[PDB]
């Protein structure tokens, strides 16, 4: 009895429902900070419903909707966004409207503060954004409409980045992604074994959430 068990037993149903739904529209927000502003969130800041902070003891600027739209418990699903290091600020600004959108299915996310990490380290080369996904229903099961909304959202991020000519960064070796995702990648540590490497990625690819997001 769990989020994943539900996805497995309703695998085809969810996919069939999703593929029949109309394109989702996300009203992008304009009153959002630019990357420098984001880095200046300090102890506390707020932009269109999202609480922000960049504590000195961390290297990420966290964003969390005060009013969470998903009522389920986090089941490990998350996405990373990888862009060329020198383009993090450009990528942030390009995605800011969607990331702060009243329509975004993502209640919580964070972006790396490039000034706090070593240029040579992998944290600077990719996965500069992290989007946390959690089941929308109180019983912690994903609804077809939410899955569709989440996939449409992620694909919207992909198109915005490509349209802005943003160059892809280096995807983490721990994540997986299909050929058509140039910036997005998926990961779920809740079930990523202890083997890592190829074995870990193959396990992720069989995850029903990932397959519903890509097939």
Curated annotation (Swiss-Prot):
<keyword id="KW-0843">Virulence</keyword>
<keyword id="KW-0964">Secreted</keyword>
<dbReference type="Pfam" id="PF03536">
    <property type="entry name" value="VRP3"/>
</dbReference>
<keyword id="KW-0614">Plasmid</keyword>
<comment type="similarity">
    <text>Belongs to the phosphothreonine lyase family.</text>
</comment>
<feature type="active site" description="Proton donor">
    <location>
        <position position="80"/>
    </location>
</feature>
<comment type="function">
    <text>Secreted effector that irreversibly inactivates host MAP kinases by catalyzing the dephosphorylation of the phosphothreonine residue in the pT-X-pY motif in MAPK2/ERK2, MAPK3/ERK1, and p38, via a beta-elimination reaction leading to a dehydrobutyrine residue. Is also able to remove the phosphate group from phospho-JNK in vitro, but JNK may not be a substrate in vivo. Could help suppress localized pro-inflammatory responses at infection foci in the spleen and liver, and thereby facilitate bacterial growth.</text>
</comment>
<dbReference type="InterPro" id="IPR038498">
    <property type="entry name" value="OspF/SpvC_sf"/>
</dbReference>
<dbReference type="GO" id="GO:0016829">
    <property type="term" value="F:lyase activity"/>
</dbReference>
<dbReference type="InterPro" id="IPR003519">
    <property type="entry name" value="OspF/SpvC"/>
</dbReference>
<feature type="active site" description="Proton acceptor">
    <location>
        <position position="110"/>
    </location>
</feature>
<protein>
    <recommendedName>
        <fullName>MAPK phosphothreonine lyase</fullName>
        <ecNumber>4.2.3.-</ecNumber>
    </recommendedName>
</protein>
<keyword id="KW-0456">Lyase</keyword>
<dbReference type="GO" id="GO:0005576">
    <property type="term" value="C:extracellular region"/>
</dbReference>
């Amino acid at each position: 009895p769990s989020t994943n068990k539900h996805l497995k037993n309703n695998f085809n149903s969810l996919h069939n429902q999703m593929r029949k739904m109309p394109v989702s529209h996300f009203k992008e927000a304009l009153d959002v900070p630019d990357y420098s502003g984001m880095r200046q969130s300090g102890f506390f800041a707020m932009s269109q419903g999202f609480q922000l902070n960049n504590h000195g003891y961390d290297v990420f600027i966290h964003a969390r909707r005060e009013s969470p739209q998903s009522q389920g418990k986090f089941a490990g699903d998350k996405f990373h966004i990888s862009v060329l290091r020198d383009m993090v600020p450009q990528a942030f600004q390009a995605l800011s409207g969607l990331l702060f959108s009243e329509d975004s299915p993502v209640d919580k996310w964070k972006v790396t503060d490039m000034e706090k990490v070593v240029q040579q380290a992998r944290v600077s080369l990719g996965a500069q954004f992290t989007l946390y996904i959690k089941p929308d229903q109180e019983n912690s099961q994903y609804s077809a409409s939410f899955l569709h909304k989440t996939r449409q959202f992620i694909e919207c991020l992909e198109s915005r980045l490509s349209e802005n000519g943003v160059i892809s960064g280096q995807c983490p070796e721990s994540d997986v992604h299909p050929e058509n995702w140039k910036y997005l990648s998926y990961r779920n540590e809740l079930r990523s074994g202890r083997d890592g490497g190829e074995m870990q990625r193959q396990a992720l690819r069989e995850e029903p959430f990932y397959r519903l997001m890509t097939e």
